[PDB]
Every structure is written in C-alpha cells, then in structure tokens.
C-alpha cells in the first residue's frame, strides 16, 4: 500500500505528458525544451532494433548518466524482460523510472522482474486486461500499451487500449463472486485486483500509449481514446524537422480536443519517418 | 433527416461528375480546367502507396490548403479508417468532402469513424450492399466502389457495382418482414435502411465508381453500369499527355452514351500508365 | 436468323484464310501482300502482354484507323472480355470484325458481352463445345480456339479442336431428348443450339485456329485437324524474315494437304521466335 | 504384314550399329568416318533443349537436306509427338527414318502419330512393355529406350531395357488366355501383339538404347543388357576430342564383349561432357 | 567415490570464477591478468563456428600447448561429443580440464564419452536435470548450462538454470520410493544420483553458466540465479575494449551482488559484439 | 569357398592399413612413401563430386595405368553401382581391387554388380548388417563403412560400425532357428551367412572405415571402435601439408592405442580441409 501508492504517485504524477525517446544529450535538450514530461534514454532506436536482429540490452550507464545530467525533467531507461540484475544496476544509477521493455531482447521467457523488490517505479507493456493486471500485480507502477514499436502504425496501440477498456467493462458488468473468482485465476492474478478495477472501472495505475505514434493526430487519437499520456519515441528525431514535430506532439497531447489547435500544429510539419504498415508484416 | 439531407445534397450535387486525384496545385488547376467536378488532395499517389509499403496517412494540411486555395471547385481529402482525430483535423481545415479511404493504412481494424458526429460529408468505399449500408448507417454521405486502387484494372470496380445492383435486387424481390429482419441483422444494420433501399431500389446516397479507371472507355462503362459519377485518380497524371486524358475522361463521363463522341475522345490519347493486371496479383 | 446469318456470312466468308496480328501499317502492308485474308490491329503483342503483366486494353483508335486505312482487306480489333463500351467504341470506328479476346485483361469476370446488341461480327475463343456454344448463343459470329497465346506452342490449340470435335461427336451419338435436355442445361445453353450442332455435326459458325501457331507446318496441322482457317499473330514479325514466313503460312494454309508444296515453303525459313514450351509453364 | 516387314527391314538392318546426333555437315562427316550406321539430323542438341525451355520443333529442311547430302549412310530426323504434318513434311523430304521424339515439345498430349499412314519407318521411345507395344501397334518400325536425354546418365536407359525384358518375361510365364486378354486391354493393345511377343520372347522390332550414353563403357553395358543397337547423341561433340570418342563408341558397340578391346578404346579419351546426374534432378 | 571426489575437487575449486575463451597466447595473458580463473583454448570461436558451417574439431595441440605454456592458471580444451580418442589425445597433452562440448560438431550422435575411464576432469553441457544427471552419471566432473553459444543472448542460459533448479525442486518435493524409481528410469539414470540430489537439493558438481554471456550485468544475473561460476567466451575479444570488458566480467562475477560496484564496472565499456537475438533464429 | 577365400584373403591381407585417394602419380608416390597399404586411383575427388553435381563415372584407364605404374603397393579403382561392364573393363586393366562405390553416380538403382563372376576382389559400402551381408552374399571380398563421403565428418562412419556391431550382436543373442530364418529372409540373404556371422560374431570379411576421416584422431577412433583398417581419401591432399598429415594418419592407424604417440603425430599438423558438418546438410 504505502510503498506502492508512492510509486503509483510518481507515475500518476506524469498524467497528460509526453515521454520521448532520446539517443543523445543534444536530443534530450530538444525534448525538454519541447514540453516533454520526461525522456527515455537508450543507445539505439526502436525502429532500428526491430531489423538488426542483434541482442538489444540495457544501455550503457555513462550514456544514460550523460543524458540524465543534461535535463531537469526525469529520465527513464530500459531493461530486458526478466533481467532483474540489469534493473538492480539502474536503480543504483538513480534513474527515475525503469521500463521493463519487451522491445529489447528478453532475458527470461518465463519470468518477468520482481519489481516489488525495487524502490524505483516500473513501467510495463500490456495488450489486454490480464497482461496489464499481471504486470501490476507484479509491482508495475505504470502501464503502457505495447503496439508495434518502430512501425509508425497506430493500428496496434489503439486496438490495445480499446480491448483493455472493452475487457475492463465486459468483465465489470458480470455477475457472481464465483464468476469473477474464475477470471482472476484464469488471468493468474489475485481476486483483489480484478476487483479494485471493476469497483473503480479503471486500472489503479496510469495507462500511457506507446508504439506506433508518429503524428500529433495519432497522439490526440489515443487520449480521446482514454490513455493518460503518451510515449513517443523516435522517429520524432528520424523526421525532417524534429524540434517542430516534438512540440507538435506535446502540444497535440495537451490540447487533444482542440480541432482548431490540433490542425494548427499539424501543418507544414515536413516529411515524417516512413513507417512500416503493420499489415505488410 | 434534416442534418443528413444537407450532407446528402452536397454529395448528390456532384452527380455526373469526375473527381480527380491531385498531388500539387499545378495538377489541381489542370484538373479544374479539364471539367473535374472536384479534386482529391493527397501527397502521395494510390498507384505508389500500394508498393511502398510504408504507412499512408492523412496528408499534411499546408499541402491541402494550397491545393484547395488554387481552385474554385470543391476539394476532398483522405483520412485513415477509424482515425476520427485525423478527420476532426480536416473538418477544421474546412475541406469540402472527407474520404475515409481504405487505400491508406487503417488506424482501427475494428471501428470506422463516427461520421455522424461530423458536419462535413464523408465518402466511403463499399464492395457490396451490406458494407455499403453499414457505412451509410454509420453516417456516410456518399459512397464509391472500392476496386483495386492503383492497378489500372476495371475488373474489380465493375464487379462491385454489379454485385450491389445484383444484391439490392435479389434481396428486393424477396418475401417476408421476417425474411428481411434476418438480412438486416446479418449485415448488422437497421431494418429501416435495408427497407428504404428496397422501397427505392437504390441506395439513399450517390454511388460513384473508384479504383481501376484508366481509360475514358472505362469511365463510360461504369456509368452505363449504373454509377452516379466517377473517381479517377492518377495515373491520369502518370500518363503521357494528362491534360488531354483528363478532358477525355470528363467528356467520356458526361457523354457516356455517345459511341461517336466516346470514340472521338479516345483517339491519339498517348501512352497511359502501365497498370498491374489484377489477375497477376 | 436474318440478322445472324448475315454476321455468320461475313465470318463464313473468311474460310480458308489466315488472319495476322499487325502492330503498325508497315506490318499491315506486308501482311496484305503476303496473302492474309485479314489483319488484327493491336498496339502490343500477345507474346509480350503475357509477361508484362500490365493491364491490356482495347487499342487506341488512331492506331487502328491508320492500320485499317492502309489495306484493302478487312481489319479486326480486340476488346476486353465483358467490356461492352469498348466494343461500342469500335463498332463506331467501323472496324470489320471485333474480337472479345481473353488474351487481354478481362473487364467482367462474370459476364461476356451482349454481342447480339451489336451489328458488327464478333469472334470468340473456346476450348470446348460448351464454351463454344455459350459464346455463340451469346451472339458470337465466329469462333477460334484459345490455345496458349504467345507461347509458340500448338499443343494447346490442337487439343482444343480435338476436344470440340470429340465432344460434338460424343454428345452427338447419344440417345434421348431428355439425355440432351440435361447437357444443354449443364453447359447453360438453349436445347436448340446443341441440337443444330448434332443435326449438322459441326458448329453453325466458322471455327478458326488461334494461339500457338508458329510454323507453316503448324497451320497445316490445324486444317488437317478440322479448322476453317488460321489466326497467326506475331511472332511472324518476331521472326528473322517475316515477309517470307508470312507467305509461307498463308501458302501452307491454302495448300495444307500438299506435302511437296508444304515442304517447299518450310525451307530456308530462318530463325523463328523462341517460344515458351507450355509444359515449362 | 508385307508393307511393314519392309519398314521393319530397314530398321532391322541397322542391328549392331550406332546412330549419332549431328548438328552440321562437318559433324555428320566426322560421324560417318567413325563407323556410325546412321546420323540424326537436328539443329539443336538434346543436352541444351532440356534447359531452354523454348519450344523444340522439327528442324528446318535445308539444314537436314545439307546434312543428308553429305553422307552415304542413312539420315534420321525428329518430329514432335502427335505432329503428323511435321512428319508428312519429312516423308516428302525423303529422309530415311523419322523419330517421333519425346525430347522435343509435344504437339498432341493425347495422340501420337498415325505412323501406319506413312511409308517411312518410324522410331519411338518406350520405357516399358505397354508403351513399347502401343507405339508398335501404332505403326512404329523401330523402338528405343527413352532414358533421361542430355543428362549423360545411363541409370535410366538401363532401367528401361531391364523393365521391358523383365515385363516381357513376367507376363510371358503366366497362364490363361483370359489372364492375357486383360493385360492386352489394360495396356490398350491388340491381344495379337502381346501374344507374338510372348511366343517370340522379344518385340517384333529392333530395340535400341538411347538417352544417357556418354562412354564406350555405357554403350557396351547396354548391349550386354539386350539392346540391338545404340543411339548416342551429343555430347560426343560436346567432348574434348569427338572424333576419338565417336570411334570409341562405334567400336565399343561392335566389340561390346571384349574387355581387352573395350579397355583399349576407353583410354586417353579426354574430358567428356559434364552430365547432370539424374538423382540431382 | 575417492577417484571422483578428486576430479570434483579440481572443478569445485573453480567456484566463483570466470573461465574465458582464448584463441591465442596474447589473448590468454590478457585473460589471466584480468582475473580469469582459467582459459578455454580453441582455434576458432563459438560465434563464428555457428555460421561456417564446417566441421568443428578438437583444436591442434601445438596451439593449445602454446596457450597453456603462457599462463599460470589452468587451461581447458574442447573435444567433440562422443569422440573418446580426441579426449585420449588431450589427457595425454596434460590439459587441466576437458570439455565435451556440444558447440563443436558431434562425433557420436548416440553415445557421449566414457569420462570415467579418464583421470582428467570433464565439463559438460546440460539444459535440464535429466541431461545433467546423465552427464554426471557418465563421469562428468563439472557441469555448465548450454544456452545458445555465440548468440550473445542470456535468454537461454538463464532458462536452463531456472529449469534445473525448478526440476530438482519439483521432483524433490514428491512422495514415494516408487514415484522416484520411475523418474530415475525415465531420465535413464541410477536411483542413487537422483537421490543424492534430492537429499542435497543440488547437483554433486559445480554448475557454471555458459552460452550467451556478453555483459557484466549478464554474468551477475546468472549468479544471483544460482550458478557456481561463469563461462564467458568471445566476444569479450570481439568487443571494442576487451581488457576492460574482461575485467568488468571477472569483477561483476565476484561482486555479483553489489549494485554500486556492478554499475561502476558497467560504465564506459565501449561497443560490445552485436549478438544474434535468439528469437530471430 | 576356394575362389572366395582367396578373394577375402587378398582383402584380409590389408588388415591394419590405410588406403589413400590419389588423383595423380605425384600424389600416389607421396602416399606410398607415407605408409599407405594401397591407393585409390580416381580422376576427381569425393569432396568435389558431391557438389558438381555431374555424373561421376569410372575413371579413365590411362590415368589409372599411370598411377598404378608408379607404385609398388596395390591400386584400387572405382566403378558405378551396378555398372558391371565398367568393372569388366577394370578387371581387364589388371587393377588390384575394385570398389563398387556409391559415391559415384549409380548405373543401376535396382541391381548391384554380380561380383562373383569376377576374379578381382571387390569392396563395398554398408551402413548396417543387412546391407553388409547382401553385398558380401553378392560376392563382396571386402567391406567398408559408407559415412558421408567428402564431408570431413566422422559422425556417420562411426555410427555405422556401431550399428553393425550393435546389430551383429543383437541378432546374435537371439533364440530360435525360425527367429533367424525370418531375419535372413527380411534382409534378403541366405540363412547360411547370417549364421556364420553369429557363429563367429563378425563378418567373414575385413571391415574398413571410410567417409569422414580427416584427422589422425579420427582414424584411431575408428579402430578403437572395431574397424580392420582405414580409407582416407582427400582431403589429405586438400590440406596444408599433405605429406605430414598422410604419415600422421598411417601412423595414427597402426598405433591407434598410443595416446602418447597419437598426440605426438597430431601436433603442428597445419590447416586441414574445411569439412561440411553433416548436421548442416
């Protein structure tokens, strides 16, 4: 409770923001000055890692320390799924948020990290209620949609948030203490969570959107859809005029319901990263 | 009723016309002066997007504003399927017609746009009655055949209009209030629509032909077949002598029953885009 | 009857001849002077179209007008299957025979043209009795074997004529008015045709050979086999010494039973188009 | 009887010989001077045709006339399976033997030639008794094994002669007039042939070996095995020292039981065509 | 008992250490001076052999003698599975530990080596309890996880140690002398071993981690997980700054529970070998 | 008996030796002077033939005569499976041993050679008892393991000898005269052989190892395993320092149980042929 609520709070305190994937301090500075609520330090970029296909690991501290020494706003970093020692090494680094990110090469195909044992807040991907709950029950402070990272395609990210919202609800308007008991056991999670969700109609944690956000339009689409905030990563920086696009997205995320404003910031944006349409995977 | 019958009216008012895909103001002006009833502004061309295969998104407003600031006739633009925010941004732009076009990379594989909530008229693709009705019931002001966009092959476009006409009719000359009730539920649409169709023998909206029109001959073939108007897009402009072909098609569409005239405008036309025969897909 | 018999007559009046695929007036003149009973005007050649694989359409009138303004003998042109407007445009052109040719990209995968409604004689491909009858019942004035066009291989052409002759006969020496009634309904045709065939032992129309004729020898082989005449197309012109080969085939077709003469015209012929053996498809 | 027994005689008179594939007069003269009992005139070579894969046809007469005007020994030529007119053209040419050769692109996948109607002796491939009998019953004067032509591999040729010899025999030592009646109908042939075979223990015609003979050793192997003579074709000429190899094979075929002599002629032979091992097909 | 407990002792004495793959003396000396408890002499490197795909054999003695003559710490060498003579040759060489390594091309797909008959201690790979026990029962002095060698990916190595630990335990807390009897026979091993394991909760031998260790972080992760020591091999040396990385790993392995220290040694490490993510196999 | 025992004797007289694949007299001399008990004359090399994939035939006599005229020790040569005439030609040549070798392109997929009819001793490949017996029953004087020739991989060779030894034994300690009767009929061989084997516990002929021997270590491994002698072929000569390796293998074969000696001869051997690991086939 006390320990948790503090973690959730830090995460919860990021509501309405935009986190940005940064590769270098230069990039970090651009992101802070653009309105980013935080930055994700990493030495190589989602849209490149998904082609390599080399092992993608925790990023080198020096690299991170630098990025995190050149900005006021908090700094996130990535660790491989199940790679608790990588996480240990980053709690030590005094990073702000850790992200057990499925976009890197997993380290345990069977066990995620025991995030409870850490004092730093974690962020985790989910594509559905169960998965969401399992990660939360596992000690996840914050949650984001998975989506197809690096693709440039919202199709996925959106579908997820829809499902979670659809699932939370479906399961919600159902009947029996036993009916639930089952669903809790099924998705391998304490009855107490599934329950706080139904009693609150929403996860206990902040639910951000990640993977496939390339346009201000997209960002806004995901808030209108329910998300609590937005992860963009490159290719903001893989675009023609990053600084501009970066701001467009931050602005698009705060005013996500201002057709007039939205449009204003969606004009003369330049050429954006050529995504890879999910379908054609 | 009232609100819609206005949207219908804008669409309905294009009867007999030819809408043209434009990529630049220069191209727009050529189209207008050619007899186009309107133009579809887009930064990249159906016949190229279907090869990329990059994510195809709403086009950049500046781009559109420009195209739409250089012509009297109305201007359409495209948004991804289900991407309501993209649409919101374009209502704002004050475009004339929006096209929720399946030729771009979809944004929701499960939900189209809630076009009712918009005041701008939408246009949608259909390959059959059900699909048609679903899009209309969803708020579609105007409807077009899908066909294989960019292929240069009528085979598809025609087949669709045939089916819709064949289906409208088949379902029409059938018997029981319950018989219908079923078909309405099946194609997931209010009994009231399927009904206005059967009572009128035709959709409540204008039904244009799109995808696979490359020759004046083709355009005429589709009107003789029942369509209310024609979408061409590039490769009018991917042809040897656009200006000439553009006019040929506009002319072929108005006089679509004048063998003498038709032929006149089908001569010395030059080399047209080398399509990609559906079959060989 | 009256209207039909006139059409059949024009077609019937081509018996024993050789029709040649021409691409340019030069080529047309060569063909006339060679003994061709007619020429097929087209802007691109069977043996190339079957590789493209671009949409193959009706040819540009100017092109045809030219070819047909440089020769006394009649001129045929091609239109896509089911593309009635294309045909309309060519009746208008005052071409002599129209060929609803399956070698082009079809326009209707479900419906051929309503050739009845036209006053110009049509020619159609068939690979068997049923198909033959269906085209004839559909208004076909003349009929040709399909064969594998552009391949340079007789295997197919021959097989067809064999089958038609084999089928006409098989069905012929069978018993009951009901026995027939069935076969008529099966191959979706009026009992009256199947009947005139059996009563005459041959279709009511001329049956030419097309697709896969590359050598004088081949032409002769197809007449000995029953055909009423021969379509060659390129690669007469894709050969080393066209003029010579053209004549050889015209001559081989008239004297198709003159081993001495046949051989005379099959010598020092030069290098002919390198076909593509059906088998290796 | 009479007519045939003359054709049989011309074929039968080649017993013990070697027929050679020639492509040019120069090649023909080399073959004659080497001891070839005859030559097979063709403009392109088995080992190349089986790669093309272009349509392989009867060869141009001039070509043949030339080859056959530069040698005393008889001259064979090829025609496509079922291509009776091609054959007609070659009877006319006054060639000595015609070979309805399956190595060329067939002209009728359903009917071989009616060799009875010809006065020139035919040669045909067979891989088994039935096939052999069918070709003979069809008017075949001479028969050869098929084998994988152009491969350089005896595996096949041998296997065939084994089977025919194995089959002739198997069927031979069986019992009932009805037992046979069946086998005759099965392999679609008059009871009278199957019968003359069993009563004589061998086909009524000469049975040569063809396809896959590359070495003197091979030739001898096939005679020891029962064949009545040998078809070699290139790559005698695709070898390093043709003249020598040609003679080696002729000599190896006559003295096919003289280990001492065989070996003598198998030495310092040079590099022979690099076959293509059946297996690796 | 006695004989083995000596071999066990040599292996057991390496507890807590790091063994390193060396390819040359220069490399050996770097490894020794780095803190390596031993080195694995081999002429070609795991990450290259798994691409070749040439036969990978015991390494040439001279090569090894040299490597083992330039370092105080013990020296291991590899032999192919089942290749007892290769092993014999290396006992003779007076190497310290032999590794019957599945990373080389096996020599017997059916029988491992009879390591009992040797006086030198062997090391063997296992992915599960059974496999582990079978190798031990076979005379294995030391055991290591297999993991995907040369990949750079821990996913595997970890998964193994998890399973073994999971299996040892699962089987442990089960009930009947017969229950066990079965499992012993199943995994084809004496009841006496499975038993010493359950009675001790751990194998009788040291269990190192191998295959997929590329980062100090990884090494530490595997000790935290239960391993008794670490095999790294190249690409320590396939990295940018080997010396540094080598030390980092040795240090990371001893202080594998010192987040502060761990992180200290994980900074400014340079570019490491670009692994090949298991998944993408 | 008498005739056989003489053949077996010559073969039997090769016990403990190493036969070497030679391509040229130079190579032959090197092999003799190295300690080879005999040489296998061939114009092209196992490790190359298995890539070609051209037909591999008996080698040209001159070639062999030369090789066999430049060495005292006996000389073997290869013939294709079932190619009895090739064998006849080589008996004539006065070669010492003939090898009906499956490494060349077979000549009869159904019948091996009737080696009984020859006075020269034959050698044959086998992978199991049955196969061994069938070849012996067929007149085989000597037998060798097959293994994957040219691969450089012992995996196979060893596996075979294991099986034969395993099979001989398995079948041996079984019960009934009828029990055996079956196994004899099954593996298509006289009860009398299977019987002499069981009564002697070993084939009546010498059993050498062949295919996949690349290292002295390998050779020794195969003797320890039961073989009576060793076929190496290239790539002894495809190695860096043939002369040395050749001797190493001869020496390794005689002293195959002298770890000290074995190792001595396995040092500073140079780079050996890069095999092709069976597995990766």
Coordinates of C-alpha atoms in Angstrom, one line a residue, chain B residues 3-281:
Chain B
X3 CA -28.8 17.4 -41.0
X4 CA -28.1 14.4 -43.3
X5 CA -30.3 15.5 -46.2
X6 CA -27.9 18.5 -46.4
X7 CA -24.8 16.3 -46.5
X8 CA -26.5 14.0 -49.0
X9 CA -27.3 17.1 -51.0
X10 CA -23.6 18.2 -51.3
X11 CA -22.7 14.7 -52.4
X12 CA -25.9 14.3 -54.5
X13 CA -25.0 17.6 -56.3
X14 CA -21.8 16.0 -57.8
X15 CA -23.9 13.6 -59.8
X16 CA -22.5 13.0 -63.3
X17 CA -19.1 14.5 -62.4
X18 CA -15.5 13.3 -62.3
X19 CA -13.3 13.7 -59.2
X20 CA -9.6 13.7 -59.8
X21 CA -6.6 12.8 -57.6
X22 CA -4.2 15.8 -57.4
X23 CA -0.8 15.9 -55.9
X24 CA 0.1 19.5 -56.4
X25 CA -1.6 22.9 -57.3
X26 CA -0.4 22.6 -60.8
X27 CA -2.1 19.3 -61.2
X28 CA -5.3 20.7 -59.5
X29 CA -5.6 23.6 -62.0
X30 CA -5.1 21.2 -64.9
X31 CA -8.0 19.1 -63.4
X32 CA -10.3 22.0 -62.9
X33 CA -9.8 23.4 -66.4
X34 CA -10.5 19.9 -67.6
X35 CA -14.0 19.7 -66.3
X36 CA -13.4 17.9 -63.0
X37 CA -16.3 18.3 -60.6
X38 CA -13.8 18.2 -57.7
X39 CA -10.3 17.1 -56.7
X40 CA -8.9 14.8 -54.2
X41 CA -5.8 16.4 -52.5
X42 CA -3.2 13.9 -51.4
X43 CA 0.7 14.0 -51.1
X44 CA 1.2 10.5 -52.5
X45 CA -0.4 8.5 -55.2
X46 CA -2.6 5.3 -54.9
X47 CA -0.5 3.5 -57.5
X48 CA 2.7 4.1 -55.5
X49 CA 1.4 3.7 -51.9
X50 CA 0.4 0.1 -52.8
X51 CA 4.1 -0.9 -53.2
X52 CA 5.8 1.2 -50.5
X53 CA 4.7 -0.4 -48.2
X54 CA 5.0 2.4 -45.7
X55 CA 2.3 3.8 -43.5
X56 CA 0.0 6.0 -45.6
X57 CA -1.6 8.8 -43.5
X58 CA -3.7 11.9 -43.7
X59 CA -1.9 14.4 -45.9
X60 CA -0.2 17.5 -44.5
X61 CA -2.7 20.4 -44.3
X62 CA -0.4 23.1 -45.8
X63 CA -0.3 20.8 -48.8
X64 CA -4.0 20.6 -49.0
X65 CA -4.7 24.3 -48.1
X66 CA -2.5 25.1 -51.1
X67 CA -4.3 22.8 -53.4
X68 CA -7.6 24.0 -52.1
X69 CA -6.6 27.7 -52.4
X70 CA -5.9 27.3 -56.1
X71 CA -9.3 26.1 -57.4
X72 CA -12.9 27.1 -57.3
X73 CA -14.3 23.5 -57.4
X74 CA -14.6 21.6 -54.1
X75 CA -11.7 19.7 -52.6
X76 CA -11.6 16.3 -50.9
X77 CA -9.0 14.8 -48.7
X78 CA -8.3 11.4 -47.2
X79 CA -8.1 10.1 -43.7
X80 CA -7.3 6.6 -42.4
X81 CA -10.1 4.2 -41.5
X82 CA -11.2 4.7 -37.9
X83 CA -8.9 7.7 -37.4
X84 CA -11.6 10.1 -36.1
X85 CA -9.0 12.7 -34.9
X86 CA -7.5 12.9 -38.4
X87 CA -11.0 13.6 -39.6
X88 CA -11.5 16.2 -36.8
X89 CA -8.4 18.0 -38.0
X90 CA -9.8 18.1 -41.5
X91 CA -13.3 19.3 -40.7
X92 CA -11.3 22.1 -39.0
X93 CA -9.4 22.7 -42.2
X94 CA -12.7 23.5 -43.9
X95 CA -12.2 20.9 -46.7
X96 CA -15.4 20.1 -48.6
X97 CA -15.6 16.3 -48.5
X98 CA -13.7 13.8 -46.4
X99 CA -12.9 10.3 -47.6
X100 CA -12.4 7.6 -45.0
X101 CA -10.3 5.7 -47.5
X102 CA -9.2 2.1 -47.2
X103 CA -6.4 2.8 -49.6
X104 CA -4.4 4.4 -46.7
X105 CA -3.2 2.4 -43.8
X106 CA -6.1 1.8 -41.5
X107 CA -6.0 3.1 -37.9
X108 CA -8.7 0.9 -36.4
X109 CA -9.2 -2.6 -37.8
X110 CA -12.4 -2.8 -35.9
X111 CA -14.2 0.5 -35.9
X112 CA -14.7 3.0 -38.7
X113 CA -15.3 6.7 -37.9
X114 CA -18.4 8.0 -36.3
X115 CA -19.2 10.3 -39.3
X116 CA -22.5 11.3 -37.8
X117 CA -20.6 13.4 -35.2
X118 CA -19.2 15.4 -38.1
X119 CA -20.8 18.2 -40.2
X120 CA -18.6 17.6 -43.3
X121 CA -19.9 15.0 -45.8
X122 CA -18.0 11.7 -45.9
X123 CA -17.3 9.3 -48.7
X124 CA -16.7 5.6 -48.2
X125 CA -15.8 2.5 -50.1
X126 CA -18.1 -0.5 -50.4
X127 CA -17.9 -3.8 -52.4
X128 CA -21.4 -5.0 -51.6
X129 CA -24.8 -3.9 -50.3
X130 CA -24.1 -4.8 -46.6
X131 CA -20.8 -2.9 -46.5
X132 CA -22.5 0.0 -48.3
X133 CA -25.4 0.1 -45.8
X134 CA -23.0 -0.2 -42.8
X135 CA -21.0 2.8 -44.0
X136 CA -24.2 4.8 -44.8
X137 CA -25.8 3.8 -41.4
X138 CA -22.5 5.0 -39.9
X139 CA -23.1 8.5 -41.4
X140 CA -21.6 8.1 -44.9
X141 CA -22.9 10.9 -47.2
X142 CA -21.5 9.4 -50.4
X143 CA -20.3 6.0 -51.5
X144 CA -17.9 4.7 -54.0
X145 CA -16.8 1.3 -55.2
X146 CA -13.6 0.1 -53.8
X147 CA -12.0 -1.8 -56.7
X148 CA -8.2 -2.4 -56.8
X149 CA -6.8 1.1 -56.4
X150 CA -3.7 1.9 -58.4
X151 CA -4.0 -1.2 -60.5
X152 CA -5.4 0.4 -63.6
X153 CA -7.9 -2.5 -63.8
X154 CA -11.7 -2.0 -64.0
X155 CA -12.3 -5.8 -63.4
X156 CA -13.0 -5.0 -59.7
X157 CA -14.8 -1.7 -59.7
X158 CA -17.3 -3.1 -62.2
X159 CA -17.8 -6.4 -60.3
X160 CA -18.7 -4.4 -57.2
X161 CA -21.4 -2.2 -58.8
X162 CA -22.7 -5.3 -60.4
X163 CA -23.0 -7.0 -57.0
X164 CA -24.5 -4.1 -55.2
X165 CA -27.1 -3.8 -58.0
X166 CA -27.5 -7.6 -58.1
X167 CA -27.8 -7.7 -54.3
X168 CA -30.1 -4.7 -53.9
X169 CA -32.3 -6.5 -56.4
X170 CA -32.0 -10.1 -55.1
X171 CA -32.9 -9.1 -51.6
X172 CA -35.6 -6.7 -53.0
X173 CA -37.7 -9.4 -54.7
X174 CA -38.0 -11.4 -51.5
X175 CA -40.9 -12.0 -49.3
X176 CA -41.4 -11.7 -45.6
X177 CA -41.0 -9.0 -42.9
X178 CA -39.0 -11.7 -41.0
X179 CA -37.1 -12.7 -44.1
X180 CA -35.7 -9.1 -44.2
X181 CA -35.4 -8.8 -40.4
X182 CA -32.7 -11.5 -40.7
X183 CA -30.8 -9.9 -43.6
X184 CA -30.8 -6.6 -41.7
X185 CA -29.3 -8.2 -38.5
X186 CA -26.9 -10.3 -40.6
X187 CA -25.3 -7.3 -42.4
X188 CA -25.5 -5.6 -39.0
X189 CA -27.8 -2.7 -40.0
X190 CA -31.2 -1.2 -39.0
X191 CA -34.2 -2.7 -40.8
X192 CA -35.1 0.8 -41.7
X193 CA -32.3 1.2 -44.2
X194 CA -32.4 -2.1 -46.0
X195 CA -36.0 -1.1 -46.3
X196 CA -35.6 2.4 -47.9
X197 CA -33.4 0.7 -50.3
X198 CA -35.8 -2.0 -51.3
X199 CA -38.7 0.6 -51.4
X200 CA -36.5 2.8 -53.6
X201 CA -34.4 0.1 -55.4
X202 CA -31.2 2.1 -54.9
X203 CA -29.1 3.4 -52.0
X204 CA -30.1 6.8 -50.5
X205 CA -26.8 8.2 -51.5
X206 CA -24.8 8.8 -54.6
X207 CA -22.7 5.8 -55.7
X208 CA -19.5 6.7 -57.6
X209 CA -17.0 4.4 -59.2
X210 CA -13.4 4.4 -58.0
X211 CA -10.3 2.2 -58.3
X212 CA -9.2 0.9 -61.7
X213 CA -10.4 3.6 -64.1
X214 CA -7.7 4.4 -66.6
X215 CA -9.5 5.0 -69.9
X216 CA -12.4 7.2 -71.0
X217 CA -13.8 3.8 -72.2
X218 CA -13.7 2.6 -68.6
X219 CA -15.4 5.6 -67.1
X220 CA -18.3 5.3 -69.7
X221 CA -18.5 1.5 -69.0
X222 CA -19.2 2.3 -65.3
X223 CA -21.9 4.8 -65.9
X224 CA -23.7 2.6 -68.4
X225 CA -23.4 0.1 -65.5
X226 CA -25.3 2.4 -63.0
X227 CA -22.7 4.6 -61.2
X228 CA -23.6 8.2 -60.4
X229 CA -20.2 9.6 -61.2
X230 CA -16.5 8.7 -61.3
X231 CA -13.4 8.9 -59.2
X232 CA -10.3 8.8 -61.3
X233 CA -7.1 9.4 -59.7
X234 CA -3.6 9.2 -61.1
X235 CA -2.4 7.9 -63.3
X236 CA -4.1 10.4 -65.4
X237 CA -1.1 12.4 -64.4
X238 CA 1.2 9.3 -64.7
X239 CA 0.2 9.3 -68.4
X240 CA 1.9 10.8 -71.4
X241 CA -0.4 13.7 -72.0
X242 CA -2.5 14.2 -68.8
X243 CA -4.4 17.4 -69.8
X244 CA -5.8 15.5 -72.8
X245 CA -6.6 12.3 -70.9
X246 CA -8.2 14.3 -68.1
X247 CA -10.5 16.0 -70.5
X248 CA -11.2 12.8 -72.3
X249 CA -12.4 11.2 -69.1
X250 CA -14.6 14.2 -68.0
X251 CA -16.1 14.3 -71.5
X252 CA -16.4 10.5 -71.7
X253 CA -18.2 10.6 -68.3
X254 CA -20.8 13.2 -69.4
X255 CA -21.4 11.7 -72.8
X256 CA -21.1 8.2 -71.7
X257 CA -23.6 7.0 -74.2
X258 CA -22.3 8.6 -77.3
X259 CA -20.3 5.9 -79.2
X260 CA -19.4 8.6 -81.8
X261 CA -18.3 11.1 -79.2
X262 CA -16.7 8.5 -76.9
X263 CA -14.5 7.2 -79.8
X264 CA -13.7 10.8 -80.8
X265 CA -12.1 11.4 -77.4
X266 CA -10.4 8.0 -77.2
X267 CA -8.1 8.7 -80.2
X268 CA -4.5 9.8 -80.2
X269 CA -4.5 9.7 -76.4
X270 CA -0.9 8.7 -76.0
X271 CA 0.7 6.1 -73.7
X272 CA -1.2 5.6 -70.4
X273 CA 0.1 4.2 -67.1
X274 CA 1.1 0.6 -67.3
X275 CA -1.4 -0.9 -64.9
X276 CA -1.0 -4.1 -62.9
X277 CA -3.5 -6.7 -64.1
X278 CA -5.5 -7.9 -61.0
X279 CA -5.2 -11.5 -62.1
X280 CA -1.3 -11.3 -61.8
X281 CA -1.7 -10.3 -58.1

